[PDB]
Design a protein around this nucleic acid. Sequence first.
DNA 1: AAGCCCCTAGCTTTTAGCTATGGGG
DNA 2: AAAGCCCCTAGCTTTTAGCTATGGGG
Lengths: 151, 129
Amino acid sequence: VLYKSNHNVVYSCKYHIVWCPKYRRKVLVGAVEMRLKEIIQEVAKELRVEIIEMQTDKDHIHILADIDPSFGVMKFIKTAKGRSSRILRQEFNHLKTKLPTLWTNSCFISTVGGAPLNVVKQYIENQQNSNRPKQKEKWKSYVDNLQTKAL
Amino acid sequence: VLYKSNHNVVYSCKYHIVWCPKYRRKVLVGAVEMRLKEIIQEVAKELRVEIIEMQTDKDHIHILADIDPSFGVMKFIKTAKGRSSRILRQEFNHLKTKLPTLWTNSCFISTVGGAPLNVVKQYIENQQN
DNA sequence: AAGCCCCTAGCTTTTAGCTATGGGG
DNA sequence: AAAGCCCCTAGCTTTTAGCTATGGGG
């Protein structure tokens, strides 16, 4: 797990984000799909967001991004959707004349870390009960590094 | 994991949050410790934040919370540190006289999900079938 | 636990098109 | 060290306070 920092915070914030075209229209294909990913890389680059992985399918775009918590994941999403919509609708006439908007008003966001919820949960509850490891070998590297980083 | 939603977003945003008192002073004990926890529960409830787990040691408080992304993790944190700082220093004299502030300007924040990073990264690249 | 319809100001993408623990249908 | 120590502005809460801001400096 790689941790970064801004002028006040030490963090590791990863998000799996997903959003669909309006009406789930299967328009994320070919040149549309390609341009869409290039625009989002552009957006991420200027918003200092790190795209760990990004793939699409006819009607969904999946993005795994590491975002400065203070900046805000929504500020990123808002920019990526908004800009891709404006641009793609200008480049691909069918997206302008056959749809009222390229995207919807919603999205799906799930946070992601180096270990599963239950592990972090236990580590937190273990704090005052001395050295009581998670298990034999399961996630030793994560817990060890964590004790060290959160010292 | 059970997702929640606001008017426009479906989400599950959990963070492992940690912060320490000024100078690492080991003051999070006894009466203080218990009150800090109450105040954080009071702020969580008020800000519609779910506290999944909260533990403390002499100089650290760990919180695993579910926070609406539209609302903002930082907004929860500043409220929690700020109010707890105000209230604790009003109730506990030794916190107001021995320290210029109760907390510091920093904190540790780590996202957590039902699945580890590598799994989610795989699932994503597998989205062409 | 969104996704459809409608609405607002705010802010970017500005003759646009998206968010807001947004309003309601 | 910088996250943590110092100092500062500016915005909002806790506001005869005390924490933020992809804040800036040291």
